[PDB]
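User: Hello! My lab partner asked me to get a predicted holo structure for this protein. The small molecule is fe (iii) ion, SMILES included with the sequence. Please write out the structure tokens.
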Amino acid sequence: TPVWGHTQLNRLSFLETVPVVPLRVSDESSEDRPTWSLPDIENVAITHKKPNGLVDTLAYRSVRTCRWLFDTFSLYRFGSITESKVISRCLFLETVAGVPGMVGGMLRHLSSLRYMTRDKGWINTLLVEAENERMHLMTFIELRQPGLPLRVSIIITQAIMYLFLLVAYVISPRFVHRFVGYLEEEAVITYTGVMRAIDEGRLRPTKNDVPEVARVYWNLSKNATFRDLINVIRADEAEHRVVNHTFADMHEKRLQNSVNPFVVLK
Amino acid sequence: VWGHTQLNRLSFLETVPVVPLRVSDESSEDRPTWSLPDIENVAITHKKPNGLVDTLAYRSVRTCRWLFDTFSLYRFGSITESKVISRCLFLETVAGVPGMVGGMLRHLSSLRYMTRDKGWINTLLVEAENERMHLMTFIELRQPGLPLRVSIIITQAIMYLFLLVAYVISPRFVHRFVGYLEEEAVITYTGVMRAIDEGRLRPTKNDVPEVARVYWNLSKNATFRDLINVIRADEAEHRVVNHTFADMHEKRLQNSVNPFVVLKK
Ligand SMILES: C/C(=C\Cc1c(O)c(Cl)c(C)c(C=O)c1O)CC/C=C(\C)[C@H](C)O
Ligand SMILES: C/C(=C\Cc1c(O)c(Cl)c(C)c(C=O)c1O)CC/C=C(\C)[C@H](C)O
Ligand SMILES: [Fe+3]
Ligand SMILES: [Fe+3]
Ligand SMILES: [Fe+3]
Ligand SMILES: [Fe+3]
Ligand SMILES: [O-]
Ligand SMILES: [O-]
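Assistant: Hello! Below are the structure tokens for the protein in complex with fe (iii) ion.
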């Protein structure tokens, strides 16, 4: 349908149309949207993949280290589950789930460029993850808008984590792929906790006006609840879990330069 | 069927030897959709340097072009097919960088600041996938030497770092520099198309590589000329897109909606 041709291709700029373009939410992201069936992802579950050698273990310990610090300094531990402390948590952490896929895709892109080789579907998987995790941030920022101290520490988190993920991927892309493997193993846990808590009425949700950003992106009918929004986010994490564990494995076997297995499901 | 059972499995390593190599998976599903007779009237344009930043973005490229042309010997003797492919192979390695760094920085910015990006990221990302497809195409028609393979490696480093700091310091300057580069690229890509029509250049690669035929939706009958003609249209989308984006920065509009995302929908 699109009216994008050579009369538009010879224009100097479209700076002038800018004031008259709607801000329809579906533009926030590409159309590689995930399609989940609520009754099917409902039975998503908690898995754990056994570390194989030193690097796998190094990876696994730092995630157990990070979970333990974060869970204790952020007081998630004692007190009853709350809406406030769930979304505040998911808000902060989602800012750092967006970085990995962008360092991998970006570096694998540069490699594809300098040795002039075919990537075989890897780049477009990691960048849709990154995107899909950024949409996880976008949704929670419709739910809780943070204040100055939480914002400043988000900025320093990215400084540090961008530097770590970047230099960790260059030296061991299996490490970073293992690391998100396990990262997501924890993200699956936390979320099924939130659903279990709703189901056992310990956290009866007040944010049921599910944001338009999330309705379009996950194609949810108006009558969707917070629990239905959470499950889909949790379903996305189970995928990344397998994707980064498959990716790490593939490296272990020296299949870096082989077809991205998840191309078939499309 | 992509459901819980597949999500609840640990690894899909056993599946690697059973999944086949398919040219359609080398990119995303966001492909250029051109019609040959329409895009035949793409044209060389030149934006006016609007101020000290543009003037610098323009004077950088012009000097890069002059230097590269006397150093590569483009102008020395006749146009040959090897001289064109050689050149565009080299240059299309560099071209994939800018959209990536741009795409990356803005991604990052929406995460720390927690703000809508409103369509820039994708456009800037498929823009880098597009140039890389030009590249994957040119690697089919020539497989460069060791001297050139080294020359290509080191040039990534200088260029990557340059754009990294460039985009952090001033994204306006980068998009302009990119806009300007893609003027020059259309000049080359029409010079080539013109050399064909005259018979100063007789291509022998009028068998267009598989990757390129499903990327651009071409026919098995399409030739070298036709391929240069779809690419040129890509280089003119990056020309407009990036000069617009840089006008948006000049006006403090870099957090409005990317206009092109309606110019599709
Ligand atoms: C807290 C951690 C795991 C649990 C976890 C996750 O790993 C992730 Cl990834 C998510 C999204 C959730 C969602 O609620 C989540 O609960 C370990 C990582 C800690 C850091 C990186 C610190 C902050 O630097
Ligand atoms: C010679 C240059 C531009 C002309 C040009 C283009 O800009 C582009 Cl983008 C293309 C595709 C073509 C077509 O082949 C092309 O001929 C600039 C060179 C820059 C460097 C050597 C380093 C990186 O700074
Ligand atoms: Fe995650
Ligand atoms: Fe997430
Ligand atoms: Fe190009
Ligand atoms: Fe280009
Ligand atoms: O996440
Ligand atoms: O290019």
